């Protein structure tokens, strides 16, 4: 039993957290490389993320808007 995935996002959707894309990613390359990693780097408005990727780009990302979840917290980031 566990939250639901839009209590999820408003619990680690976080300045700082590490992220890939995740199951709803509809967005080609954006995360800038294969299996990129980016940093969220603000709060959530109307259900979109702000992320800056490795890579370099920055752009927002839905976790709650739409209804749907387009990241997910990366590999070895455990908060």
Known sequence: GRENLYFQGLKYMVPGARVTRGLDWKWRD???SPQGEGTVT???H???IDVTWDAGGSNSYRMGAEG??????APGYDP
């Open 30 to 32: 954006q995360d800038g």
């Open 42 to 44: 603000g709060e959530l």
């Open 46 to 48: 109307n259900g979109w």
């Open 68 to 73: 749907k979840f387009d990241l997910k917290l």
